[PDB]
Design a protein around this ligand. Sequence first.
Ligand SMILES: O=C(Cn1nc(C(F)(F)F)c2c1CCCC2)Nc1sc2c(c1C(=O)N[C@@H]1CCNC1)CCCC2
Ligand SMILES: N[C@@H](CCC(=O)O)C(=O)O
Ligand SMILES: N[C@@H](CCC(=O)O)C(=O)O
Lengths: 263, 263
Amino acid sequence: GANKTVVVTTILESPYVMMKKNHEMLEGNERYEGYCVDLAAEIAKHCGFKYKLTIVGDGKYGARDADTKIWNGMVGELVYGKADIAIAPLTITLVREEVIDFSKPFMSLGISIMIKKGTPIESAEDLSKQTEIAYGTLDSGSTKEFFRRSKIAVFDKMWTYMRSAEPSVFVRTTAEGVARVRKSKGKYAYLLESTMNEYIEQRKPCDTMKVGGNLDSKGYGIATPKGSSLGTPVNLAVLKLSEQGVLDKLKNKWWYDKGECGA
Amino acid sequence: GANKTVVVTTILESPYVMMKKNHEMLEGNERYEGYCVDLAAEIAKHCGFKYKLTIVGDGKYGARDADTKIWNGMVGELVYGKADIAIAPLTITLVREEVIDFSKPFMSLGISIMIKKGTPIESAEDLSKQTEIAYGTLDSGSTKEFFRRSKIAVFDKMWTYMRSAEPSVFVRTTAEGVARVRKSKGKYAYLLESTMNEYIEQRKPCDTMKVGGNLDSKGYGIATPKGSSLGTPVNLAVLKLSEQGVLDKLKNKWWYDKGECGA
Ligand SMILES: O=C(Cn1nc(C(F)(F)F)c2c1CCCC2)Nc1sc2c(c1C(=O)N[C@@H]1CCNC1)CCCC2
Ligand SMILES: N[C@@H](CCC(=O)O)C(=O)O
Ligand SMILES: N[C@@H](CCC(=O)O)C(=O)O
């Protein structure tokens, strides 16, 4: 029927969506800033809809429980009808593609290694061949699943270690993973997406580093419930924004214009 | 109805599809080798179909004539019903997305600069600010369209030069562009996709080089006629192959295992 205000699910993840310092001063969409806040505005303008940004209730990206088969996170909010679109750093994966629609990618990324500066690790192979430096991933996301399902020798070796490590090497939020790298004196390395790694690398106190090549190559897509009428126009908008250079401009805005660690 | 032999349109473009040295000895799909030959085999296996590789009649990727509105190339072969699927380095673009279906990307690329080794050019900006070194693109493709439609200062400046340059800076095939770089003594630079640039860089006589960062960021997708039943299973196959590491393995096979210029 007639156009309705679109409910957008997203996640507090820097620099994609961040609470403005004075958010209690503010209301609605104005509380938030970042790459995905800007992207949401652009997509909405190019598709002719009004929208409401909402932070996913459980603070998760989206995973399906093996027993209950229930989806959590942003994927859950789409699947169960709580939100109309997810505009966030949501990784395109096979298991998700089967239950939600994805746009063509608006940003590329790969799994990558974050270290505290001076940590004697250059690669995944290096991590896998030692035990003094612990390492882990975010839970309820595509990185954890990557290791869990990998049949590649090095990554299987890493997963075999991570799943049984004590204390737990897994974290609830990216900020938690970063905090642990920073506070563990080089004895913890964090496996996270290159995009987030490269952002943090240019933030004070300038004490972390991305090392080695990416472990995989993929992208984030804008997600809609399977068969939603929003899917087509949203996909065209992403392609138009890409071709206009708008996506590149926004990356510059939120990553390198935000750089606090020099050149 | 019942499963039918799938007609695959593709293009002779190294290392994606190449005629085996002894092709006149061979018949059908066995005449060809390369990344997209291997990908076609994998996609067909994972989707449960039989197929016939065919080289696009006009040797073009696909562009729409401004007057007649007729599509040429591989895109034309899909649009007019001559082929069931395109498995090739076919760039995902807005204008194409509106007339054909694309899988999620199976390979990333960006527009890039090829020079003869020793050419005093480091960037697009460098090319745009001089006239002694000519430069151009392939015709009937996404790179030419990129420059034609760009509102970005440097690229508009480049397009303004390229469209009126004499003699023509445009070429019919990638091999032609490469031949011209190689034979023009540093007085021609070629604008082509990073994937093709990086392949040629590792081929004898080892006299070309990719310089500067990419001008854009995008990907190739597997294409089907709009609404075709093949689209869904093909897209899942691409994601599965990505997640299994098969796409990375095939890239290594055809780019770096094929490297003739040392380390
Ligand atoms: O192909 C990719 C990344 N990418 N994404 C995927 C997957 F979709 F997640 F499966 C895969 C790859 C590569 C390897 C195979 C699987 N990236 C792609 S394709 C593509 C775009 C962009 C992109 O990042 N977006 C650019 C990056 C900079 N500005 C926006 C933009 C529109 C045209 C098609
Ligand atoms: N982008 C990931 C979350 C981050 C991670 O898993 O490292 C996802 O969509 O699940
Ligand atoms: N991949 C391009 C062809 C190569 C180019 O334009 O540089 C296309 O699909 O049109």
